[PDB]
């Protein structure tokens, strides 16, 4: 069945924040479904004859997936989000069984038919779940949230999904409807429903539909259920600037997209829903894609971790080496992003947020221990190494990093230089170094420093033959201990310059320049020692790059001043768009950047042309007959509202 399109209603607006506002016209920017957009009306299953039409369009998740369903029986059950929809990558599974809603994050190996299995039970007369045929695996499960069913119980059902900075948000709302297929033209705010810190990459969306015991049978014939009623709506959210309206109760009564059309742009720039008759300039004639550009120079004062990591010689565990690190910037994700490290476990902090935190003092301790001994290094553990060679506080903060080094720290005769304190009088405290060579007097006999039957040398060394095998192979183990004190911190993570992007008319804020424009290569070379090339004007056509060694041109989005002429919102809905100092042939030059934004190809109407010295005018007819001015357009000729 070919895909179909339907006109999006104004519905889709969700609360951007949990903050409460009353009787306030508040403007916010986020991902949104544009007004009057095209919604792909997936007629998922059609049954006339009992003809199964199994359709599960795996749509690209993109920024935000606006969902709408008219299923009276609520046949649809949850949604599926995943980069690859297999065990290879992490996937999000949402199931809306009646008992509770299941939100479990696992690397599910999804089957070819991703449906919800439910069998009718004769004794209980209940549509209770049979089995989950949607997936086949549950690997590396991370996050689980359980709540009551929200889609469970002629009523329109709407949802918005967004994936931002590893944080998953859901908005929901239900409204009764008497329209068979037309989306009601009513403003329905979508209150926040649940927020999830899933923290995985999601690329494509797939919806889930429950197959009853009729469809559970292998044959195409259905036992007692038909899915012809299945139908829903899908729309893609894009970054948009909105002018929300809050009432006294705080409900979002209405909103206008700054990119919907010139009148809504005038509404946005005037910060009011109702504007009077006249001429007004607008700025948010469309939205800024991607991310605003802010610069920091690439890091120079790196912390000398690699010296500790790549030191030619390491000390034995008993005489473990210690280095203090401060007054530098350190990257840990780079260490995390290395398969050369066999063991990378953190305690008291997440490896992902490691670059986010600051510490006054960071102590790195390294030594050599054989493979099976790496377990004891973890905080709160027990064992000979933990007790007599090195111990960590139970409240330790930091990470333990290890890797095999049989290639380097072993020889044909085996390395005996690496040593472990086998015997000691008492268990070591955390952060305690013992280097005493005094003979261990296990027995009561005072040996006076002479080896005997009950007197043992406290120290013992590995053989480290290369063929002993992993678990006996040397592991160069480095322990990162972070000291968190009420002192001005020194160690801090790196600052990211967002890599580099090109040809996007977005905000440039090179170390806080606070400008707007499109990124293009600059052939002109400004003064090099400046971080950014300085123009005679405050706004600089070309901005030098602190990160790289380059200068990049910038260009504003609206080279023409978007002056919109329209009567009062009470008066009429007609619009008049004037591009000041722009020829009607340069109106297509504007239309290029405008048509980069969707539906502005349709907008500016059909670009019906009337040229004035002040600028080319589109959206009105020139009045040949002389008349008194209605709106001071310019050049002594004005147009008025009429039938």
């Amino acid at each position, epitope marked *: 069945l070919p895909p179909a399109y339907t006109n999006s209603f104004t519905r889709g607006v969700y609360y951007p924040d*949990k903050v409460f506002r009353s009787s306030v016209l508040h403007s916010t920017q986020d991902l949104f479904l544009p007004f009057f957009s095209n919604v792909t009306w997936f007629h998922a299953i059609h049954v006339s004859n009992g003809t199964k039409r199994f359709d599960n369009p795996v749509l690209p998740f993109n920024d935000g997936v606006y969902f709408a369903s008219t299923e009276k029986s609520n046949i649809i059950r949850g949604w599926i989000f995943g980069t690859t929809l297999d065990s290879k990558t992490q996937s999000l599974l949402i199931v809306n069984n009646a008992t509770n809603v299941v939100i479990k994050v696992c690397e599910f190996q999804f089957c070819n038919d991703p449906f919800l299995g439910v069998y009718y039970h004769k004794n209980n007369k209940s549509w209770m779940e049979s089995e989950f045929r949607v997936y086949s695996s549950a690997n590396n499960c991370t996050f689980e949230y359980v709540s009551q069913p929200f889609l469970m119980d002629k009523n329109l059902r709407e949802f918005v999904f967004k994936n931002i900075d590893g944080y998953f948000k859901i908005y929901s709302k239900h409204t009764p409807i008497n329209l068979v297929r037309d989306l009601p033209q009513g403003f329905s705010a979508l209150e926040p429903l649940v*927020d999830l*810190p899933i923290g995985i990459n999601i690329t494509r969306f797939q919806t889930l539909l429950a197959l009853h015991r009729s469809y559970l049978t292998p044959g195409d014939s259905s036992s007692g259920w038909t899915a012809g009623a299945a139908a829903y709506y899908v729309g893609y959210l894009q970054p948009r600037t909105f002018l929300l309206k809050y009432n006294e109760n705080g409900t979002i009564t209405d909103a206008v997209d700054c990119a919907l059309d010139p009148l809504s742009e005038t509404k946005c720039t005037l910060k009011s829903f109702t504007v009077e008759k006249g001429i007004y300039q607008t700025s948010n004639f469309r939205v800024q894609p991607t991310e605003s550009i802010v610069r920091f120079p690439n890091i120079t004062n790196l912390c000398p971790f690699g010296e500790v990591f790549n030191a030619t010689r390491f000390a034995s565990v008993y005489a473990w080496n210690r280095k203090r690190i401060s007054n530098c910037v350190a990257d840990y994700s780079v260490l995390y992003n290395s398969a050369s490290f066999s063991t990378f476990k953190c305690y*008291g902090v*997440s490896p992902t947020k490691l670059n986010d*935190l600051c510490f006054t003092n960071v102590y790195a301790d390294s030594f050599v221990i054989r493979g099976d001994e790496v377990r004891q290094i973890a905080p709160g553990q027990t064992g000979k190494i933990a007790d007599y060679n090195y111990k960590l506080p139970d409240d330790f903060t930091g990470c333990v990093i290890a890797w095999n080094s049989n290639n380097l720290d072993s020889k044909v005769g085996g390395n005996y230089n690496y040593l472990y304190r086998l015997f000691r009088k008492s268990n070591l405290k955390p952060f305690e170094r013992d280097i005493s060579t005094e003979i261990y007097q296990a027995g009561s006999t005072p040996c006076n420093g002479v080896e005997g039957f009950n007197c043992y040398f406290p120290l013992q060394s590995y053989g480290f033959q290369p063929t002993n095998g992993v678990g006996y192979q040397p592991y160069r183990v480095v322990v990162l201990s972070f000291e968190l004190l009420h002192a*001005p*911190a020194t160690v801090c993570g790196p600052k990211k310059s967002t890599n580099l992007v090109k040809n996007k008319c977005v905000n440039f804020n090179f170390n806080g320049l606070t400008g707007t424009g499109v990124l293009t290569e600059s052939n002109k070379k400004f003064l090099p020692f400046q971080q950014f090339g300085r123009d005679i004007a405050d706004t600089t056509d070309a901005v030098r790059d602190p990160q790289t060694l380059e200068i990049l041109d910038i260009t504003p989005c609206s080279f023409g001043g978007v002056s919109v002429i329209t009567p009062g919102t009470n008066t009429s809905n007609q619009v008049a768009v004037l591009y000041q100092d722009v020829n009607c042939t340069e109106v297509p030059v504007a239309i290029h950047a405008d048509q980069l934004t969707p539906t502005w190809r349709v907008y500016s109407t059909g670009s019906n042309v009337f040229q004035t010295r002040a600028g080319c005018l589109i959206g009105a007819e020139h009045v040949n007959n002389s008349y008194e001015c209605d709106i001071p357009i310019g050049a002594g000729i004005c147009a008025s509202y009429q039938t």
Partner: antibody
Amino acid sequence: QVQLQQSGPELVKPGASVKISCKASGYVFSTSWMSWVKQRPGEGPEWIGRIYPRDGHSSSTGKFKDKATLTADKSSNTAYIHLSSLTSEDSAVYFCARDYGYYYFDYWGQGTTLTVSS
Amino acid sequence: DIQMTQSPASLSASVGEAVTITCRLSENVYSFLAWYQQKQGKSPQLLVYRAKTLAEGVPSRFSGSGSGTQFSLKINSLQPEDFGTYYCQHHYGTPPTFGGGTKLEIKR
């Protein structure tokens, strides 16, 4: 021994730009981060950003990225926060607080109430 | 973003009683939370950062506890000056978020 003082409360027309001055004493200005926190009346305060004077670096959240720009003068140990496009929603009380880099705040200035109205 | 939940929202107790205020966070922050006391018209004052670490110049009556999602601020003995509003705030990195606000009233 750690004293933090801010300028008096300011009345500004909506849509304009305002600057708030915070003064620090009794400790090295450069070594310790100085931040800003904005509190709506009858509502919990919110973090704004941080500035670290010796290099002039400033980090802030996207919500106030356009609104707030952090500038710190090492000479007078006085860091000025600049707010622009003032709205009625923006009008609230603002505090400057010393930070040892851990985003927890041991000292706090008396605060300045910002009022936005016609 | 990060969600702050405080229970109870409002609490009242008499002098010398034991009061516990609970904080709940969406994500797991291991130990990087800070407790602040606020009085009307005043600046906030730091009470407990980390979990058990009392701030400088804080009466020994105040105590912090909890790990991960659950964080508890416990007052062993209430005092007349302890009245005010109490906030729980993570400092696990940008952006720090303050709590909704817990009202404490000294009963008499």
